[PDB]
Amino acid sequence: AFNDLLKQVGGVGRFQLIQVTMVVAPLLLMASHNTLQNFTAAIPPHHCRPPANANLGGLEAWLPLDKQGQPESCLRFTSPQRVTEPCIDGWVYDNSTFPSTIVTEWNLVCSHRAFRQLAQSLYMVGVLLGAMVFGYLADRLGRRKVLILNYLQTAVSGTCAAYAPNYTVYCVFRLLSGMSLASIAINCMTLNVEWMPIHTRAYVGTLIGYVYSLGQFLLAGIAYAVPHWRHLQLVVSVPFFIAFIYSWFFIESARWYSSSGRLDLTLRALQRVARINGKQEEGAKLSIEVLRTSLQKELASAMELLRCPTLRHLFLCLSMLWFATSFAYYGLVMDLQGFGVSMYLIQVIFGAVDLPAKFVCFLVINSMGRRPAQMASLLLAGICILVNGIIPKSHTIIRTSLAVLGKGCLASSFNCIFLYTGELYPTVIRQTGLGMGSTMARVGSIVSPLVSMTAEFYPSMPLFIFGAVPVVASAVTALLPETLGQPLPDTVQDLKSRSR
Numbered sequence: 001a002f003n004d005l006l007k008q009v010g011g012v013g014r015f016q017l018i019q020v021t022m023v024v025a026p027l028l029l030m031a032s033h034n035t036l037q038n039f040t041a042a043i044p045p046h047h048c049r050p051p052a053n054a055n056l057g058g059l060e061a062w063l064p065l066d067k068q069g070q071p072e073s074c075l076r077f078t079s080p081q082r083v084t085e086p087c088i089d090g091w092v093y094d095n096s097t098f099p100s101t102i103v104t105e106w107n108l109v110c111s112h113r114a115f116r117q118l119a120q121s122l123y124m125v126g127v128l129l130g131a132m133v134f135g136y137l138a139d140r141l142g143r144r145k146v147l148i149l150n151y152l153q154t155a156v157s158g159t160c161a162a163y164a165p166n167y168t169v170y171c172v173f174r175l176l177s178g179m180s181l182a183s184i185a186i187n188c189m190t191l192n193v194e195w196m197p198i199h200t201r202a203y204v205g206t207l208i209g210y211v212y213s214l215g216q217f218l219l220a221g222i223a224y225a226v227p228h229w230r231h232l233q234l235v236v237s238v239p240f241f242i243a244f245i246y247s248w249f250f251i252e253s254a255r256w257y258s259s260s261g262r263l264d265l266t267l268r269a270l271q272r273v274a275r276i277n278g279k280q281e282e283g284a285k286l287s288i289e290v291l292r293t294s295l296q297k298e299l300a301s302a303m304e305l306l307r308c309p310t311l312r313h314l315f316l317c318l319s320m321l322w323f324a325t326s327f328a329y330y331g332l333v334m335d336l337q338g339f340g341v342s343m344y345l346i347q348v349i350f351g352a353v354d355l356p357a358k359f360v361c362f363l364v365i366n367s368m369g370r371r372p373a374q375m376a377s378l379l380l381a382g383i384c385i386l387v388n389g390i391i392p393k394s395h396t397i398i399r400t401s402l403a404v405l406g407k408g409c410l411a412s413s414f415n416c417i418f419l420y421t422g423e424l425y426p427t428v429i430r431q432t433g434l435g436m437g438s439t440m441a442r443v444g445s446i447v448s449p450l451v452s453m454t455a456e457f458y459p460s461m462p463l464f465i466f467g468a469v470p471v472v473a474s475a476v477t478a479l480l481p482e483t484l485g486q487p488l489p490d491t492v493q494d495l496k497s498r499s500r
């Protein structure tokens with residue numbers, strides 16, 4: 001049993017802590033890269049630029065007013081003061097708060113403001129692609145080698161996106177940066193669990209969710225001192241150059257080495273760690289024959305989830321839970337400008353509510369159960385988003401509190417759905433089901449920017465859609481069975497026995 005070798009070579013020793021911390025460090029900037037468009041693509045107030053030949057009645061005579069008493073964003077009078085025409089001569093952007101964003105740089109306003117959501121959608125497309133493309137590559141080149149490439153790719157793509165000359169190049173490199181960063185998080189949990197004892201896997205999963213939470217604090221601080229979008233994009237990308245330098249000293253997972261049929265590589269990795277842990281004597285006792293004897297016992301397809309009728313309803317129901325959680329999450333954390341409060345304050349509060357929300361989730365999970373915790377978190381998040389759309393924008397304090405509560409509930413749902421998925425699937429398909437569930441989360445983060453484009457015609461439509469989906473997801477949770485206090489299933493037969 002590989003757990004016995006891990007315990008023999010040191011268990012949770014110096015090497016485990018060092019490698020875990022080094023590997024989990026990029027998760028701090030993971031959130032910054034995920035939600036950078038809140039600050040690099042912020043929309044400042046804008047209006048039609050008056051004609052160059054005309055002399056500034058003044059500016060107020062050239063801009064028609066709206067119902068709220070503000071100049072129209074993309075309408076100007078043909079003659080000074082009533083025929084209105086779009087901004088042929090460009091827009092004038094208020095630089096009091098945002099000196100320059102991709103919206104002001106390339107005029108992604110009005111007839112072109114849908115390009116702002118397309119850039120975020122394309123970045124999440126790379127995140128989905130990186131999960132699938134680099135997931136297969138990790139199983140061939142190893143988790144360490146792929147992590148070295150991902151640090152280089154993120155630094156190069158992030159720097160290149162900062163120096164992008166036009167919109168097309170920015171979208172391509174944002175997609176490329178997402179590909180490596182998606183596998184950075186995936187290979188961070190994979191490489192960590194293979195070097196850590198089975199009884200401490202829950203700590204790794206909890207820690208990764210934590211490091212993502214303090215990553216939201218970092219983005220608000222970084223974006224505050226670095227308001228320019230080109231500098232902000234570059235600043236959050238150059239640390240991966242440093243991570244690339246020290247990633248050469250990582251130790252490849254010994255479990256993967258055995259799966260590749262290379263026991264000599266497995267033995268050297270185990271002996272090297274025991275040197276670090278201070279157990280050279282036990283490491284010297286290990287031999288190639290001993291590894292074969294211990295790992296002999298250790299040594300289904302993704303289409304099985306759609307073939308077995310019992311597994312079908314588990315895969316379908318869990319997919320909606322994964323989709324709706326991420327679909328509503330990214331439709332809410334990527335709309336920080338509508339609450340009437342400073343965006344840096346909202347980002348700080350959004351990351352601050354994560355800590356009590358996950359703490360409350362563990363209390364509810366252990367007390368009432370996984371299913372009531374999943375229903376309550378999704379239903380409350382859906383209700384909070386729905387009420388947010390109904391309430392007028394003038395209630396900045398009330399609307400912010402509902403968004404913060406909804407964000408906390410959605411973050412609560414993310415923690416519960418990860419634990420719920422592990423205890424639902426049998427051990428034969430537990431890893432495949434977890435990967436497929438995370439895939440649907442990435443799909444939800446792709447469709448969410450597309451739904452946000454519907455604010456062109458119906459301003460309240462995205463909020464209604466972002467809120468209605470979690471409500472339906474809470475209903476579909478009732479079909480799932482409660483797993484609190486129940487033994488973990490091993491085969492498909494255990495699933496039928498529990499249902500019967």
Ligand SMILES: CCCN(CCC)S(=O)(=O)c1ccc(C(=O)O)cc1
Binds near residue numbers: 326411415
């Ligand atoms: C399975 C990946 C989920 N994600 C969506 C991918 C597009 S995620 O962005 O990486 C994320 C979000 C929030 C939390 C949390 O606060 O618990 C953790 C992870």
